[PDB]
Amino acid sequence: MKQGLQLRLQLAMTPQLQQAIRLLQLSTLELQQELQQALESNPLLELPVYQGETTQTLQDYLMWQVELTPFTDTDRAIATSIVDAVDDTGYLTIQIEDIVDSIGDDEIGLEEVEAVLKRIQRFDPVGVAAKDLRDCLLIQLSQFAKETPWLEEARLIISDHLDLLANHDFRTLMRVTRLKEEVLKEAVNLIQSLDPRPGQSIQTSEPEYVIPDVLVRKVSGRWTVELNADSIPRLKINQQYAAMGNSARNDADGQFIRSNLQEARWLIKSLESRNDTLLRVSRCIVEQQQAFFEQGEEYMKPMVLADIAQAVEMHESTISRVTTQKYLHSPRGIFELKYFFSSHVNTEGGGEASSTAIRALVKKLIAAENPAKPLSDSKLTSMLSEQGIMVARRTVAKYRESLSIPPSNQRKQLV
């Protein structure tokens, strides 16, 4: 009747489940780190060489040549110091002045440092120790014979006209360099194949790093999702200490051991239940994925924390902590749980959902517009009109930045 609020409807909190959620929101790698750092005191809580082959790593390959090259002790020291602060791309990390300071010799000067670098500038490969790469591509072209045409045009452009090509400003470039029409592009292309980051070329090899935590294998539609068994932590109750407590003459001390053990059993069961709740949540998510992942991120409905926590009895904070730093390997592959949710929109697909791979493939088509110039946001809007889903140019710029696409008047290139 006469509405309002009226009295109706305390105790003591503890951070127990709170610390547990701190673990769950924390990633399982460091979460297991704590799990070990936890189970340590809880006593009831459970060839050498193979192939053994060394490698060059490039800089030592440079040193191999330096050893065969004639060099003095100060020359060897300067070259070695130059080698010490070297980047993967093969450009010089520190300037010549920093190298002169590192040599710490008044006899060592910038000119001697430059001479040492130049004698070692193009030994292997061309354009090593690029030193703010620019003269590096210059030395690379200089290595090429002048018999190659348009070498002069490319050289004049690289001399002091890097900015004109930086914005892809072909008209301003032609107006400045007086470069030939439809021919200066030839010098540009000869410059384009100039082995940039040539030192980056040596580096090629890596091992694998992604942890499948849950596995949905699309088992006969509506994937049979399953976590990783070995990755799931588990303790073993000290049954010896369980039998070392009651019979303890201090039946008090031993039964208290039993009580602490029972409490830890509760803790472990709660963690397992956290895993299982995450698992049933994963069942709902996999029901979603049998269409979304199967239709890919393009046909994916944006979901919310509210939406998922509604399907469960889990609290919104409960889920919000539960999935933090979680990733599962699927038929698609290893995919992060934090990636699962997405913001919805005002598109005229009849509904609200997220751009995602739609935005990515939109960037793809905008690039796929005539390679002369990047497609503007109006192109995206028309593409969406064809898609029948509402998208806006501010929204287009947003989704493009999400796909990290180049700007419309920055990605224009000579076809």
């Binding site: 992604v210 499948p212 390997h329 592959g333 290893i334």
Partner: protein, 49 residues
């Protein structure tokens, strides 16, 4: 066949109906095996993760 012109129009009509039936039946069966096979074409393999 003139769509059962009616040469006997009795069993020839009947036989013609049956034959067109089997003909479409084979057309469908062929297309069906074709579709199953074509699905198998791009059916796709299981690589490691």
């Amino acid at each position: 066949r003139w769509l059962e012109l009616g040469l006997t129009d009795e069993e020839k009509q009947n036989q013609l109906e049956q034959l067109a039936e089997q003909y479409d039946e084979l057309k469908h069966e062929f297309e069906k095996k074709l579709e199953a096979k074509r699905r198998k074409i791009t059916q796709g393999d299981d690589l490691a993760p």
